[PDB]
Paper text:
The replicative [name] from the hyperthermophilic archaeon [name] (Pfu) is a member of that polB family and is used extensively in biotechnology applications including high-fidelity PCR. We had previously used polymerase evolution by short patch compartmentalised self-replication (spCSR) to discover variants of Pfu with a dramatically enhanced ability to incorporate Cy3- and Cy5-labelled dCTP and replicate Cy-dye labelled DNA. The resulting variant E10, derived from an exonuclease-deficient version of [name] (with mutations V93Q, D141A and E143A) and with additional mutations in the conserved A- (V337I, E399D, N400D, R407I) and C- active site sequence motifs (Y546H) was able to efficiently PCR DNA while completely replacing all dCTP on both strands with cyanine labelled dCTP (Cy3-dCTP or Cy5-dCTP) giving rise to highly-fluorescent products, termed Cy-DNA with applications in advanced microscopy applications. In an attempt to better understand the molecular basis for the altered substrate specificity of Pfu E10 polymerase and generally gain a better structural understanding of the primer-template duplex recognition in this class of DNA polymerases, we have solved the crystal structures of the apo Pfu-E10 and a Pfu-E10:DNA binary complex at 2.4 Å and 2.9 Å resolution respectively and compare them to previously obtained structures.
Pfu-E10 displays the domain structure characteristic of DNA polymerases, consisting of an N-terminal domain (residues 1–130), an exonuclease domain (131–326), a linker region (327–369), a palm domain (370–450 and 501–586), a fingers domain (451–500) and a thumb domain (587–775). The electron density is well defined for the N-terminal, exonuclease, linker, palm and fingers domains of both molecules in the crystallographic asymmetric unit, but some parts of the thumb domains are disordered. The final model for chain B is the most complete, but is missing amino acids 612–614, 669–675, 693–695 and 757–775. The two molecules (chains A and B) are very similar (rmsd of 0.8 Å for 690 alpha carbon atoms). There is a slight difference in the orientation of the thumb domain, which has a slightly more open conformation in chain B than chain A. This is likely to be due to the different crystal contacts in this region. The structure of apo Pfu-E10 is very similar to both these structures, with a superposition rmsd of 1.0 Å and 0.9 Å between Pfu-pol and Pfu-E10 (molecule A or B respectively, 685 residues aligned), and 1.0 Å rmsd between the Pfu-PCNA and Pfu:E10 Chain A (694 residues aligned) and 1.5 Å for Chain B (715 residues aligned). The greatest difference between the three models is in the thumb domain, especially in the region of residues 679–730.
Numbering used by the authors: 1 to 611, 619 to 665, 677 to 688, 724 to 757
The structure:
């Protein structure tokens, strides 16, 4: 399988290198056949003779066009002729662009700024991470001695921990009595040990959490001071710092450095992205945290190093376990987009769509649009985008609530109404659909570029999903599930990509229309559900609705909802489709994006209603949702505020674990005095509880 691809310069010529793994053996395949190029669109094709001899410059040398070739291409569907100007080196493209474009006969040039290594994979039709191979994965993390606001690297590396399928160990240079700790002469030898472990294990993928920014640079500066080369690459090379956007990543030749931090960021949203939080959110079970001050005290003492060696071992053990869960997802992406995992895992979802479309463009013989200019880029970043329909909810405490929503709404709209730049207001178009309120017309004679790709993606997902019912092989079933996750993520990225400033296939009109159509069909369901079925819609947001039959029986509401989805789907066009998603026993709605519901199992879901103060507002939700008693909830608030004045509540519950609030905290460096009360009522209890009770017409006066 193809793991990575770069290129090196030999005697002025570009040489591609395909880093591979085949039959459990590593090999590098060189390729000197490929040639970089750019496209030229001319007024007059006879003027090509003048364009052929246009000269450029680089490092004082003379850069010229080595070959030219006439080719038929498509541009936004419409046929077009272009000249393929070949060059010696990829780095000749900027200078040849500058001067070829200045020619009066040349109208524009295209596909001039695609990196050479990625150009090779697209053109050769090479997809990385294909086939079945036993890839060896290894994770690692490091513990450092921090002291003072000091330079990055002055503190010695206290521990280097690592973990794989078989084991999880710690390498250090102090006497510790643990069975997974390995003691060594000094820091220098600790680093040399780590190099031996990487050498013996010889991993295909090295996994870190935040390795680009912290672990590799800190190891490198340390290794520089100690006079020791980091022979981590499979050709003995050191880790190389490389840039992409506003990020400096770390590269390892022969292997794939997989930094987990970048994959978790664009996927799920959390308050903070610590290694402990991410582990708990994913796996459920908790992970203890040891802090810098605890490490600094225990290290210089010589005792209490068992606690730090535990934390360091678990850092490596957790990173491996997270890596094992997110890597199979990411290899399917890289296999779906068709670029290497090093790049794909550090790419934003908008840029992953770009690399997908550039590959597909080549399969369809179609010329890509250029990146926007700096003036065009800043223009797009200024414009605003109108969101989905949100309704001001019906207030009060409601019973037996059904939630209905659309399946893949925006993708289904893009396919049904053929929404893309190449079909926008097409000249000489026979049959077209008009977007509501915005009036943009999309041609439906031929399926466009993006709508056709997306339609195929959703087809392939259904095949995988159907085959998953059938399969009994657990390895296949889990493989299919990731393939299905990868396609889904990629498919939901297309909407956002249309409004993405940097995108080549940018189309605000397409994005306006997708949102506009979404608002039409949500309101259609709203009208059809309240008139023909007699329901009362409680709240609507973007692609889903909460509703019920006020005072109606629980079992009847479910039945009439399951009937409505069958009905409404007969009216909805193409891929548009509604589904029965869930049922709730009770629920109330304060305002937009602010509500709380409760399922039949008693589990209480919330949104917008967030942070003794956290305990009370949780106790308020329970008495409202479980028992349906708003008056009882008010008594609880009156009881809690009374305990604050009389101090009947115990200590510690009033404490907060974290120039500002830390004025008295800075002094601590080296039964009584329980006076705080007004603070806990005004700043903590009321703001949390009022957020809920405002919907039922209560004020600060009622509580206080």
């Amino acid at each position: 399988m193809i793991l990575d691809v770069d290129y090196i310069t030999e005697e002025g010529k570009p040489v591609i290198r395909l880093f591979k793994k085949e039959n459990g053996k590593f090999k590098i395949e060189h390729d000197r056949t490929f040639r970089p190029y750019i496209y030229a669109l001319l007024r007059d094709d006879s003027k090509i003779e003048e364009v052929k001899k246009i000269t450029g410059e680089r490092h004082g040398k003379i850069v010229r066009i080595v070959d030219v070739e006439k080719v038929e291409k498509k541009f936004l569907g419409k046929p077009i002729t272009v000249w393929k100007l070949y060059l010696e080196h990829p780095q000749d493209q900027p200078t040849i662009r500058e001067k070829v474009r200045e020619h009066p006969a040349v109208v524009d040039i295209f596909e001039y700024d695609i990196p050479f290594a990625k150009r090779y994979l697209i053109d050769k039709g090479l997809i990385p991470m294909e086939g079945e191979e036993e890839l060896k994965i290894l994770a690692f993390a490091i513990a450092t001695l921090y002291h003072e606001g000091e330079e990055f690297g002055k503190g010695p590396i206290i521990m280097i921990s690592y973990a794989d399928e078989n084991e999880a160990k710690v390498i250090t240079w102090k006497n510790i009595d643990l069975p997974y700790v390995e003691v060594v002469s000094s820091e220098r030898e600790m680093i040399k040990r780590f190099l031996r472990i990487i050498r013996e294990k010889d991993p295909d993928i090295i996994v870190t959490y935040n390795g680009d920014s912290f672990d590799f640079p800190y190891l490198a500066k340390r290794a520089e001071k100690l006079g020791i080369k980091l022979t981590i690459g499979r050709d003995g090379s050191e880790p190389k710092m490389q840039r992409i956007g506003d990020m400096t990543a770390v590269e390892v030749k022969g292997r794939i450095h997989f930094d987990l931090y970048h994959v978790i960021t664009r996927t799920i949203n959390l308050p903070t992205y610590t290694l402990e939080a991410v582990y708990e959110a994913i796996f459920g079970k908790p992970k203890e945290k040891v802090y810098a001050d605890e490490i600094a005290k225990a290290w210089e003492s010589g005792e209490n190093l068992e606690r730090v060696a535990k934390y360091s071992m678990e850092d490596a053990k957790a990173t491996y376990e997270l890596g094992k869960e997110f890597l199979p997802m990411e290899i399917q992406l890289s296999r779906l987009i068709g670029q290497p995992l090093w790049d794909v895992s550090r790419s934003s979802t908008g840029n992953l769509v770009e690399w997908f479309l550039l590959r597909k463009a080549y399969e369809r013989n179609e010329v890509a649009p250029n990146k926007p200019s700096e003036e065009e880029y800043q223009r797009r970043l200024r414009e605003s985008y109108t969101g989905g329909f949100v309704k001001e909810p019906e207030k009060g405490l409601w019973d037996d609530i059904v939630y209905l929503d659309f399946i893949a709404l925006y993708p289904s709209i893009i396919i049904t109404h053929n929404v893309s730049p190449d079909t926008l207001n097409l000249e000489g178009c026979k049959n077209y659909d008009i977007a509501p309120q915005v009036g943009h017309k999309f041609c439906k004679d031929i399926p466009g570029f993006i709508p056709s790709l997306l339609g195929h993606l959703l087809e392939e997902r259904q095949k995988i999903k159907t085959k998953m019912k059938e399969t009994q092989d657990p390895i296949e079933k889990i493989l299919l599930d990731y393939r299905q996750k990868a396609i889904k993520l990629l498919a939901n990225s297309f909407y956002g990509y249309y409004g993405y400033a940097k995108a080549r296939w940018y189309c605000k009109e397409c994005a306006e229309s997708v949102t506009a159509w979404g608002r039409k069909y949500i309101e259609l369901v709203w009208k059809e559900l309240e008139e023909k079925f007699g329901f009362k819609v409680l709240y609507i947001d973007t692609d889903g609705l909460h509703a019920t039959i006020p005072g109606g029986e629980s079992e009847e509401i479910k039945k009439k909802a399951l009937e409505f989805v069958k009905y409404i789907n007969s009216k909805l066009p193409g891929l548009l489709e509604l589904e029965y998603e869930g049922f709730y026993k009770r629920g109330f709605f304060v305002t937009k994006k602010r509500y709380a519901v409760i399922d039949e199992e008693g589990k209480v879901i919330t949104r917008g209603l967030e942070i003794i103060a956290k305990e009370t507002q949780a106790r308020v939700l329970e008495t409202i949702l479980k028992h349906g008693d708003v008056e009882e909830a008010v008594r609880i608030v009156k009881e809690v505020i009374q305990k604050l004045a009389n101090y009947e509540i115990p200590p510690e519950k009033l404490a907060i674990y974290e120039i500002g609030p830390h004025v008295a905290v800075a002094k601590k460096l080296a039964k009584k005095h329980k006076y705080d009360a007004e603070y806990y009522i005004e700043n903590q209890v009321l703001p949390a509880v009022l957020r809920i009770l405002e919907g039922f017409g209560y004020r600060k006066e009622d509580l206080r």
